[PDB]
Design a protein around this ligand. Structure first.
Ligand code: CHL
Ligand code: CHL
Ligand code: CLA
Ligand code: CLA
Ligand code: CLA
Ligand code: CLA
Ligand code: CLA
Ligand SMILES: CC1=C[C@H](O)CC(C)(C)[C@H]1/C=C/C(C)=C/C=C/C(C)=C/C=C/C=C(C)/C=C/C=C(C)/C=C/C1=C(C)C[C@H](O)CC1(C)C
Ligand SMILES: CC1=C[C@H](O)CC(C)(C)[C@H]1/C=C/C(C)=C/C=C/C(C)=C/C=C/C=C(C)/C=C/C=C(C)/C=C/C1=C(C)C[C@H](O)CC1(C)C
Ligand SMILES: CC1=C[C@H](O)CC(C)(C)[C@H]1/C=C/C(C)=C/C=C/C(C)=C/C=C/C=C(C)/C=C/C=C(C)/C=C/C1=C(C)C[C@H](O)CC1(C)C
Ligand SMILES: CC1=C(/C=C/C(C)=C/C=C/C(C)=C/C=C/C=C(C)/C=C/C=C(C)/C=C/C2=C(C)CCCC2(C)C)C(C)(C)CCC1
Lengths: 194, 91, 165, 217, 194
């Protein structure tokens, strides 16, 4: 019980208490069955880790001034060359496609063979946290909460750039310039009848 | 474009392919006794121009009579002359 | 076009036949007066005739070398080139009404087999029951596919088969 | 009970505990189609789907149709919405029709297999995990779970009233769409303009005057 | 039971459970009888192996740039010479026809004499898999699934080149260029009334 998403309302019966991010949030009754609930726990944590990585990446890209996340893949359709922190990358689209396919296929198959495992250990624990399994539960809670936040932020990225076409930090900068003059009601495509 | 090479190689190939691999499958169809062994239970002429008279002896270890040779050689000649005839119309 | 012909609008033979019919009709018209009922009927015939030619030209009909309309009986071809109103729609209309008649009759037969004298109600029609069933089947195809899918449309092999084999 | 025709003999197949427990029963079966309870079951499913898609379609006609007479929402007429949309769009209409055939055929296949077997779609391992919430809710045609998100279908005291409102509005919606079609072929303008031209002069502009809807007078 | 081709519906009675690729897929009731079912298992596996070989071959031909699978036999009707990976092949149409007839006749007769056998062993097992007959069942499952996929892909090759006349990789390339602009609805011969 990290909280309750709606004060007063009763928690659902199928959510077990010992579980990270257990707010009892389920209007649709999607996880009423055991095996499906386990699969959903796996999916939530994994999507969270990938969302964290992507959001941190797009932020780092724009914060260190290398275009947005939308024009990082610009060098492949329009002829050019990739980059990292100010150095060129000598590869072709098919080359990175091949190495990405092989590497990701290998890694995800290897992961997808050990049943459903969410917390590995030993060599995915190289610094020595979460050893006592006591504060590890709290670290699980922090993990899942930051993951939910990251997912929401990334959906924000997709919608925001689908609406105004600008990058995240550019949009934040101009919003801090004139708060009431430009947000999702000056969007002109969010709320139609304005 | 030699006719002897095409025809000789053809008949050799078909006699070989009838010799080694399609022998037993041809000899599994010798057993018609399940349905016909008395083609004609006859006594005299007009019945033994219809019943077996002679048996072609083979000291061949597998047992090719002259008839199987005639058959596979005949197919070989048909296919060989087909090859030469398709070659014949100016390639 | 569709198997080597032309539509009747620019068909030369079409207008020639039209002119010929009007010519014979006016020839019959000439010898009467201008108020006579003969002339009234003749002018009515002229109006109906010219209206018929205009109606056949308007519907996009197809004429051969005789200048006569030709119907196209092919689903793909007629539906592709805009001719669904000469065979396709007529066949679905007829199948609807014919199955309707048959279904109404069959329902009457089963309705009267369950009495004490099936022959009297066959020779002397039960008019209330006949009108009732005459209404009750306007949607027959749905009831037909239901009777098919439940297996009551077909008698089993208690039918009398010829003896012997 | 209510009947469509007071004094008319209500047929015996619409007078059962199984048929009176249906939404919007008014004993209306002049052509005796529903003599087979299985057929009545299937036809009820047909009525429900037609109700829901009819409401959706007619709302799509009206609400942009009404709001365009105000300032916002410049929407073209419903019989011309496709053309303009496809000129606005990015793909030809053939590919769109193919994609909707696929994406709708999958779903309709689901629903169909649930009609043939009531507790079908929920059996372990079939889907990736929505098999949890793809069973029925004991009344065929009214699933639960991911449908009805807001939980309105939980209370038992409003149940028959939600049902009955649905079926009544749906029947009215089907009538509305047939009206849209006939008014399109009859007068030749949008339904909102027909409403305006009838309120402007009722005793002169109706289907007794349009010259097509009854040609014998 | 690898799965069920139609959730909810009952499996047919004549399919035995211990069998690779047993999804219960049989609307026409084609395999209700024992001997016919055995023959069909033989045929399915063999067609699968040949389909795998053919599809891999056409993909290799086009991927290494030697024309399509449709113009590999082009050198025999129009005068020319066969090839392999950049080297010429010194044979005539009748020469390869003769060696093909003899070799295939020998091989297929030899195979067709040992009853109906689908999994040989010993010298058709030269690397040492499928020895315990435990995971061999899973390998059978993978075999038959990849075979079904290959058959479908090859039928796709035939139909695709019968419609548009281009090769597989060229068709994929142009489809990735403009997805909505060119697929089997822009085909003009697939769906007629467009
Ligand atoms: C299913 C209901 C439906 C209805 C009533 C209409 C109505 C219409 N659409 Mg339409 N559409 C419908 C489905 C769809 N349309 C389109 C995309 C288009 C386009 C691009 C165009 C139309 C056009 C038309 C008009 C002439 C087409 C015709 O002859 O109708 C026959 C088809 C039916 C009656 C639907 C079958 C039921 C007609 C008013 C044309 C138009 O607007 O001209 C004024 C036009 O260019 N529609 C798509 C996306 C694939 C649909 C999805 O199902
Ligand atoms: C190879 C033969 C084969 C055939 C002909 C089908 C056909 C079908 N499967 Mg199926 N499956 C088949 C193999 C398999 N299926 C499945 C797992 C499923 C699932 C989970 C589902 C189906 C469904 C369907 C139906 C989709 C109907 C539709 O409208 O498609 C139109 C849609 C498309 C063409 C594209 C959709 C993307 C249809 C009866 C669905 C169903 O239940 O329908 C009632 C469904 O939910 N199949 C597995 C893995 C176990 C298979 C392995 O062989
Ligand atoms: C990546 C998707 C994902 C998945 C699979 C889960 C999975 C889960 N969450 Mg969860 N969650 C997520 C994202 C996700 N979460 C995000 C982003 C947030 C922040 C908003 C939360 C916040 C949250 C809370 C507060 C709680 C859960 C809980 C749960 C568990 C039970 C609920 C359930 O059955 O989930 C099944 C979930 C799905 C099947 C999601 C599938 C996606 C749906 C079908 C479509 C969504 C479309 C989206 C709305 C479109 C937006 C577009 C935009 C333009 C508007 C389950 C393990 C409960 C729990 O105990 O935590 C473990 C709980 O109390 N979640
Ligand atoms: C190519 C090799 C490969 C392989 C073999 C796998 C294998 C696996 N991955 Mg995986 N993955 C890969 C590459 C791969 N991945 C890559 C490159 C990424 C991105 C970095 C991911 C991201 C990823 C996530 C985030 C998750 C997995 C999961 C899984 C497991 C689920 C298996 C399954 O049935 O999914 C079958 C899946 C599909 C057929 C595709 C599903 C498509 C989804 C529903 C559509 C999502 C919306 C779509 C992206 C549009 C978004 C638009 C955007 C603008 C917002 C499985 C072990 C899941 C897992 O572990 O759960 C147990 C999981 O949560 N993977
Ligand atoms: C009584 C038998 C019969 C015959 C001889 C034809 C003859 C014809 N039809 Mg046809 N058709 C029929 C019944 C028949 N139809 C019925 C009952 C239907 C309704 C299902 C159709 C639906 C139909 C369509 C939708 C199309 C044709 C077309 C054609 C023409 C070429 C295709 C063809 O011959 O396929 C051989 C036909 C058969 C062996 C009879 C079975 C009927 C099948 C279902 C029709 C086959 C259509 C075909 C695959 C389309 C080929 C496209 C073409 C460009 C190559 C040809 C004039 C095509 C056309 O317009 O040509 C220009 C076309 O697009 N037909
Ligand atoms: C399932 C029912 C249904 C269907 C098939 C359509 C179909 C359509 N609507 Mg629509 N609509 C509907 C219900 C429906 N509407 C409802 C209920 C509303 C009220 C919220 C609207 C409000 C609406 C607006 C405001 C607009 C459309 C538009 C459109 C067209 C383009 C759709 C598009 O580009 O989106 C993908 C298309 C003909 C657009 C249009 O008319 O362009 C031609 C448009 O601007 N719709
Ligand atoms: C080479 C053909 C072939 C053959 C002989 C078999 C044989 C078999 N399959 Mg099978 N299968 C095949 C291809 C084949 N498969 C392909 C390509 C797929 C993927 C789509 C599958 C998917 C599949 C599943 C999912 C299942 C089977 C099963 C079975 C077994 C029982 C069914 C039966 O009686 O099959 C008899 C089959 C035939 C007689 C096929 C003959 C071909 C027909 C008569 C004509 C087909 C024409 C085609 C549709 C035209 C397309 C043209 C295009 C333009 C549209 C049997 C051993 C079941 C099983 O237990 O697996 C072992 C089962 O559940 N199959
Ligand atoms: C819970 C629940 C429950 C109840 O019952 C019901 C409901 C309510 C329905 C539900 C809800 C749900 C939800 C909301 C969900 C959401 C999700 C998401 C958002 C996800 C994302 C997710 C997301 C994600 C992962 C993301 C990721 C990202 C990434 C990787 C990125 C990448 C990249 C990079 C490198 C950078 C460059 O430049 C580019 C790119 C390529 C771009
Ligand atoms: C009851 C009974 C019983 C007894 O037994 C007998 C009798 C009497 C016979 C019967 C009766 C019957 C009836 C009357 C029926 C009717 C129906 C209907 C009307 C339907 C519709 C129905 C209708 C419907 C669904 C509709 C739908 C619609 C839609 C989708 C739309 C769409 C759209 C839109 C949105 C817009 C865009 O832009 C276009 C379009 C595309 C156009
Ligand atoms: C299952 C079932 C059951 C139920 O009961 C009923 C039904 C449904 C009817 C059924 C179904 C069926 C089906 C679908 C089937 C399909 C099949 C196929 C497709 C095959 C292929 C198959 C296919 C195959 C083998 C293929 C093969 C191929 C190949 C070798 C290739 C070759 C080649 C090469 C070297 C290359 C060059 O450049 C040329 C060539 C010469 C070209
Ligand atoms: C001694 C010996 C040997 C050898 C053997 C041999 C080599 C044999 C041969 C045999 C032969 C070599 C046979 C052949 C035969 C032939 C034939 C039998 C032919 C036939 C022909 C035909 C049939 C033709 C026909 C025709 C004509 C005339 C023309 C064209 C068309 C036609 C086709 C109709 C060895 C050393 C191995 C060892 C052991 C011992």
């Amino acid at each position: 019980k990290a909280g309750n998403w709606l004060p007063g309302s009763d928690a659902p019966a199928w959510l077990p208490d010992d579980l990270p991010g257990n707010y009892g949030f389920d209007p649709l009754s999607l996880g009423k069955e055991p095996a499906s609930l386990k699969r959903f726990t796996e999916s939530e944590v994994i999507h969270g880790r990938w969302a964290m990585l992507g959001v941190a990446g797009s932020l780092a890209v724009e914060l260190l001034g290398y275009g947005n996340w939308y024009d990082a893949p610009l060098w492949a359709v329009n002829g050019g060359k990739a980059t990292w922190f100010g150095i060129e990358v000598p590869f072709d689209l098919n080359a990175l496609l091949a190495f990405e396919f092989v590497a990701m296929a290998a890694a995800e198959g290897q992961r997808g063979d050990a049943g459903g495992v969410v917390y590995p250990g030993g060599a995915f624990d190289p610094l020595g946290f979460a050893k006592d399994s006591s504060k590890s539960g709290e670290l699980k809670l922090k993990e899942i909460k930051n993951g939910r936040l990251a997912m929401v932020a990334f959906l924000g990225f997709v919608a925001q750039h689908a609406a105004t076409g600008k990058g995240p930090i550019a949009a934040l900068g101009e919003h801090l310039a004139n708060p009431w003059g430009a947000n999702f009601a000056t969007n002109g495509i969010s709320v139609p009848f304005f | 474009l030699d006719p002897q090479i095409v025809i000789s190689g053809s008949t050799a190939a078909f006699l070989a392919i009838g010799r080694f691999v399609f022998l037993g499958y041809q000899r599994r169809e010798a057993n018609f006794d399940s349905t016909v062994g008395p083609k004609t239970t006859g006594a005299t002429y007009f019945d033994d121009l219809q019943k077996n008279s002679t048996i072609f002896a083979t000291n061949d270890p597998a047992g090719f009579n002259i008839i199987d040779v005639a058959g596979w050689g005949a197919l070989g000649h048909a296919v060989g002359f087909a090859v030469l005839a398709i070659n014949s119309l100016q390639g | 076009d569709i198997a080597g012909l032309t539509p009747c609008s620019e068909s030369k033979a079409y207008a020639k036949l039209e002119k010929k019919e009007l010519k014979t009709l006016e020839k019959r018209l000439k010898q009467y007066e201008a108020d006579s009922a003969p002339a009234v009927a003749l002018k009515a015939t002229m109006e109906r005739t010219k209206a018929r030619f205009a109606n056949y030209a308007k519907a996009g009909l197809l004429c051969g070398n005789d200048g006569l309309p030709h119907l196209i009986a092919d689903p793909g071809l007629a539906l592709k080139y805009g001719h669904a109103g000469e065979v396709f729609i007529p066949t679905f209309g007829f199948l609807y009404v014919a199955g309707y008649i048959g279904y109404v009759g069959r329902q009457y037969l089963i309705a009267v087999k369950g009495e004490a004298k099936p022959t009297d109600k066959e020779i002397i029609i039960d008019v209330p029951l006949a009108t009732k069933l005459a209404w009750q089947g306007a949607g027959w195809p749905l009831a037909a596919v239901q009777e098919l899918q439940r297996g009551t449309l077909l008698e089993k092999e208690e039918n009398i088969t010829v003896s012997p084999r | 009970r209510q009947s469509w025709l007071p004094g008319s003999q209500i047929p015996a197949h619409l007078d059962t505990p199984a048929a009176q427990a249906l939404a919007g029963n008014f004993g209306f079966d002049p052509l005796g189609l529903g003599k087979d309870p299985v057929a009545l079951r299937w036809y009820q499913q047909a009525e429900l789907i037609h109700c829901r898609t009819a409401m959706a379609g007619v709302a799509g006609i009206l609400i942009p149709g009404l709001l365009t007479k105000a300032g916002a929402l410049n929407v073209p007429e419903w019989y011309d919405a496709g053309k303009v949309a496809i000129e606005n769009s990015f793909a030809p209409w053939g590919s769109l029709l193919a994609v909707q055939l696929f994406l709708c055929g999958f779903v309709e296949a689901k629903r169909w297999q649930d009609i043939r077997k009531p507790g079908s779609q929920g059996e372990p391992g079939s889907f990736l995990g929505f098999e949890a919430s793809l069973k029925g809710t004991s009344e065929l045609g009214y699933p639960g779970g991911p449908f009805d998100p807001l939980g309105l279908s939980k209370e038992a005291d409003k149940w028959a009233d939600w049902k009955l409102k649905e079926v009544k509005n749906g029947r009215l919606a089907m009538l509305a769409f047939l009206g849209f079609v006939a008014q399109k072929y009859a007068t030749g303008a949008g339904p909102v303009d027909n409403l305006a031209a009838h309120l402007k002069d009722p005793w002169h502009v109706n289907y007794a005057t349009n010259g097509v809807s009854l040609p014998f007078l």
